[PDB]
Design a protein around this nucleic acid. Structure first.
Ligand SMILES: [Mg+2]
Ligand SMILES: [Mg+2]
Ligand SMILES: [Mg+2]
Ligand SMILES: [Mg+2]
Ligand SMILES: [Mg+2]
Ligand SMILES: [Mg+2]
Ligand SMILES: [Mg+2]
Ligand SMILES: [Mg+2]
Ligand SMILES: [Mg+2]
Ligand SMILES: [Mg+2]
Ligand SMILES: [Mg+2]
Ligand SMILES: [Mg+2]
Ligand SMILES: [Mg+2]
Ligand SMILES: [Mg+2]
Ligand SMILES: [Zn+2]
Lengths: 141, 184, 142, 140, 36
RNA sequence: CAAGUCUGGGCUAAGUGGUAAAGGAUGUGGCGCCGCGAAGACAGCCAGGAGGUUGGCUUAGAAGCAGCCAUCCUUUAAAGA
RNA sequence: UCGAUGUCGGCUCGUCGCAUCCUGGGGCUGAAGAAGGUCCCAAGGGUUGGGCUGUUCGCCCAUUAAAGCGGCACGCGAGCU
């Protein structure tokens, strides 16, 4: 799918989402990026779907960079079961995304394909996005 | 390039930045003042410029100073800059990442491939009067697989860098072929 | 063909939820326990009432519909393949395609009519020629 | 190219041409005949040599036409200079042929009329774009 | 016709706004749309 | 229903106000920086609107207009492989 | 609510919602006509009789313009069974 090969622990606490992305606010790779505007948990099935959507669009062309990785496990109890009796079983994994995070990047693609591309990738995310270029995002030192 | 600058007394950071003035500080191995340089021209300039071309800083003293920006802290949520560091100069040779153009067409753009210009702004040690520009590199010979890198380039007399030299400056990688799918 | 996959996506299935029948209490009267999975493109309908829940009975009715399908969807790969082979198989006295006799020493191709005289030689792999002729006699009537 | 509302421009074979395989019936669909462009036509094809013959047609609705013969298409005349028959499934940087500098000026004595330029150098840089279409190298 | 995301399809499509509702006029019928 | 249909400057035309999301639209109002404007097209209105060349390959057919690849050059006021 | 709120189904009596099964308008159509499909507006009024099973739900027989899906303590036992 797109899970992590190994993990020290199988289930982990849900947590929370206090705004600000902390890190990942600049481009640093491609030429155009897709920046998250709302906080959320992005499931690997979305990351996947978005990726395929781009390659499908501009088939045989530039390179795509996936800046996030679903390492947080998602728990979910079975159906018709009551509360308690231990934590549920993992149904998949999700990556935590906060406002300002650059989720994707594209390179070696015309500005048209790029825009159109990312516009489609944002239609698969449970949140709102924004597309960017590159310019002040040069924190090299 | 040029640009007006004013003296900051150190009063209401978050306020002087909304009113239009952009906070910042100019320093060196001697003095260091706190100032405010409006977003308007700063933006316009900073985008054309960057941290490569020198800038003037005409204060109420006329004192036009040559400087380069070292640190620009953004605002995360909703792009905007929150601070800027001005490095004063003189004749002292120091570092700075110099732009990189890669004139050419690799052989890795005929059967699938794209240039990943990794470090397209190399840091180099050199004095003021010695501040070039578009330090082009050749790309017309980069085959699909194997690809150039390190500091194996044309360093005009005076370009006494600070790399390794190994730091992969650019590479040619395959495309994104629709042919995929899997599982198991 | 080689794969073995029948993923019946719940796209052509019409599931019904009728009130349970038989014993129980107030809950058997008032809870829509019984379920009926209906295979629309075929006409087959399976039902379940073994348990007291709907989500375990429609899933148990699919562990049955998949089974009865895994025999009536393979029965057609056995009936579309029992008339797809041909007909020449009586093995009886009078249904021969080629005759090999080492007594008087000869090979008789009853399709083309040829009579080769090297039988101990044909029993080594030299078949190109009678296959050349069998691919002319066979695909010459269609 | 001529006038419109009833014309067709094709690039006939060489030696024989009367049936329907090449474009034989397509011109009958838009108005044509069998006794006007087969034998009382191959007077030119018997002279032009072989390969392809870009001769065209012009319908008038009465068996009349402006049978303006043309010079072999730049797609074929190039197979003569290099040698290959097709060109390349996909052009670019690799190709099974070669064509030196003056190799492209060997065809300059073939294609000279209606190209647009009477001279040899103001009309060769046109075929050099055609040397990046089929593929054929430019030995340099 | 009637959907939630109404946009311009072909070059000739025009975005009209009649009776408070967002409509789409065009040469060929299949392109008509009315937001709602 | 006791106490200003008070004063000054704005915004909204939906009864929004007086429930709701992804997402759509030349709805309005105010700010931006870029074009390009007597080499006076911003839209209509007159005429043009080309040749190698139908680029190759693939294809019953692929002639700019199924798709893959390359994607230059020439004639002119201009016109794309 | 356990110092009591009778629980399936049928029968009787209905009434309300529309995300409409007919009937009435209408836009597309891969709408020639007729007959179909999908979608929008619109309940005012209709929505049949049997076989089987306690059945609801279903399958089936013969029709019909259609044999709509839901709410009302999966309406209704101080009305019946
Ligand atoms: Mg950092
Ligand atoms: Mg009063
Ligand atoms: Mg209201
Ligand atoms: Mg009581
Ligand atoms: Mg009582
Ligand atoms: Mg209709
Ligand atoms: Mg009709
Ligand atoms: Mg309605
Ligand atoms: Mg009886
Ligand atoms: Mg009712
Ligand atoms: Mg209930
Ligand atoms: Mg009662
Ligand atoms: Mg009673
Ligand atoms: Mg009583
Ligand atoms: Zn249109």
């Amino acid at each position: 799918m797109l899970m992590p090969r190994r993990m020290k622990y199988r289930k982990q606490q849900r947590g929370r989402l206090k705004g600000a992305t902390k890190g990942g606010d600049y481009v640093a790779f491609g030429d155009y990026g897709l920046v998250a505007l709302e906080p959320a948990w992005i499931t690997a099935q979305q990351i996947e779907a978005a990726r395929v959507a781009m390659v499908r669009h501009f088939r045989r062309g530039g390179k795509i960079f996936i800046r996030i990785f679903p390492d947080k496990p998602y728990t979910k109890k079975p159906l018709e079961v009551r509360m308690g009796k231990g934590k549920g079983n993992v149904e998949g994994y999700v990556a935590v995304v906060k406002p300002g995070r650059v989720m994707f990047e594209v390179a070696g693609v015309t500005e048209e394909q790029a825009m159109e591309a990312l516009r489609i990738a944002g239609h698969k995310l449970p949140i709102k996005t924004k597309i960017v270029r590159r310019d002040a995002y040069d924190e090299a030192q | 390039y040029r640009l007006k600058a004013y003296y900051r007394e150190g009063e209401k950071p978050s306020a002087l930045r909304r009113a239009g003035k952009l906070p910042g500080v100019m320093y060196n191995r001697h003095l260091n003042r706190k100032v405010y340089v409006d977003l308007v021209e700063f933006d316009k300039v900073f985008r054309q410029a960057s941290i490569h071309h020198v800038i003037v800083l005409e204060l109420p003293d006329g004192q036009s100073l040559p400087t380069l920006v070292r640190q620009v802290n953004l605002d995360k949520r909703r792009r905007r800059p929150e601070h800027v560091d001005f490095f004063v100069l003189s004749d002292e040779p120091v570092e700075m990442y110099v732009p990189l153009r890669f004139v050419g067409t690799p052989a890795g753009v005929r059967a699938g491939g794209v240039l990943q210009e990794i470090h397209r702004d190399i840091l180099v040690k050199v004095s003021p009067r010695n501040i070039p520009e578009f330090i082009e590199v050749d790309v017309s010979g980069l085959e699909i697989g194997d690809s150039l890198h390190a500091s194996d380039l044309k360093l005009p007399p005076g370009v006494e860098l600070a790399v390794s030299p190994e730091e992969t400056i650019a590479a040619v990688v395959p495309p994104e072929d629709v042919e995929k799918l899997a599982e198991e | 063909d080689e794969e073995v996959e029948v993923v019946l996506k719940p796209e052509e299935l019409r599931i019904d939820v009728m009130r349970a029948s038989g014993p129980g209490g107030q809950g058997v009267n008032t809870t829509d326990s019984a379920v009926r999975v209906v295979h629309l493109p075929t006409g087959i309908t399976v039902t379940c009432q073994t348990t007291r829940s709907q989500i375990k009975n429609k899933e148990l009715a699919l562990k049955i519909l998949k089974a009865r399908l895994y025999e009536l969807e393979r029965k057609k790969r056995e009936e579309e393949l029992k008339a797809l082979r041909g007909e020449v198989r009586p093995i009886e006295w009078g249904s021969q395609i080629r005759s090999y006799v080492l007594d008087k020493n000869y090979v008789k191709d009853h399709r083309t009519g040829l009579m080769r005289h090297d039988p101990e030689n044909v029993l080594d792999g030299d078949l190109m020629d009678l296959i050349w002729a069998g691919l002319e006699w066979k695909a010459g009537r269609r | 190219m001529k006038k419109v509302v009833a014309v067709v421009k094709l690039q006939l074979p060489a030696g024989k041409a009367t049936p329907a395989p090449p474009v034989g019936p397509a011109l009958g669909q838009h108005g044509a005949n069998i006794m006007e462009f087969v034998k009382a036509f191959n007077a030119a094809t018997a002279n032009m040599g072989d390969a392809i013959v870009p001769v065209e047609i012009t319908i008038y609705a009465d068996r009349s036409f402006t049978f303006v013969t043309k010079t072999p298409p730049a797609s074929y005349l190039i197979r003569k200079a290099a040698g290959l028959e097709k060109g390349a499934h996909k052009p670019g940087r690799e190709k099974v042929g070669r064509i030196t500098w003056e190799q492209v000026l060997e065809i300059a004595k073939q294609k000279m009329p209606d190209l647009n330029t009477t001279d040899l150098e103001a009309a060769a840089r046109m075929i050099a774009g055609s040397a990046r279409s089929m593929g054929v190298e430019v030995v340099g | 016709k009637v959907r939630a995301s109404v946009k311009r399809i072909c070059d000739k499509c025009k975005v009209i706004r009649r009776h408070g509702r967002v409509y789409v006029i065009c040469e060929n019928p299949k392109h008509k749309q009315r937001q709602g």
